[PDB]
Ligand SMILES: N=C(N)c1ccc2[nH]c(Cc3nc4ccccc4[nH]3)nc2c1
């Protein structure tokens with residue numbers, strides 16, 4: 271997250287860190303046994319780390335659970351990143367408490383202008399590399415599709431939306447992929463892609479979760 275602030279320990283209780291010997295992507299807990307992340311974060315051998323704040327220090331509120339199965343969206347296209355979403359089932363159910371909570375799925379899509387909270391342990395420099403150990407947060411609004419499509423001609427589908435600042439300065443970045451974009455208490459997006467980080471006229475692109483609620487509900491109930 272570039273231009274954001276330190277969230278504070280466990281203030282984003284549904285945020286998960288996907289680890290395969292190191293942190294490589296974020297995710298969101300939707301219920302005690304399931305996590306939603308980005309399909310491009312797919313790897314075999316994932317351990318889900320819940321209740322984290324500093325990912326390099328065991329502070330006492332963590333729960334590290336291995337994944338029993340991963341399901342990438344049936345129509346995920348790695349070349350365009352269309353349908354960039356995946357579900358991960360935990361080997362054991364997590365214990366929900368103050369520090370570990372699930373986030374609600376949306377009943378409708380959000381409007382341009384809605385402010386959202388984006389979080390993650392990704393790079394914090396637009397030009398440079400600095401990976402933080404504690405969770406960073408960013409409040410950003412959903413942008414109009416017109417400004418989104420003008421920034422990325424021929425690359426935005428109906429399963430994506432842009433959020434951020436066209437002026438640059440504030441944005442999600444690599445290391446943040448798969449993490450949550452929560453607006454009005456619902457999970458509306460998943461950090462997916464962009465062009466560099468915090469560049470002018472290059473906002474972040476997110477998977478539009480409201481288009482996948484039926485697939486999510488159906489898939490978790492059958493697995
Ligand atoms: N500015 C952003 N909001 C941004 C978020 C995440 C991200 N991740 C990458 C690198 C990146 N681009 C791809 C394309 C396809 C598969 C993986 C992948 N990783 N850039 C970005 C940019």
Ligand SMILES: [Ca+2]
Pocket residue numbers: 322323324325326327328329332
């Ligand atoms: Ca920790």
Ligand SMILES: [Mg+2]
Pocket residue numbers: 295296297389390391445446447448449450461
């Ligand atoms: Mg994240």
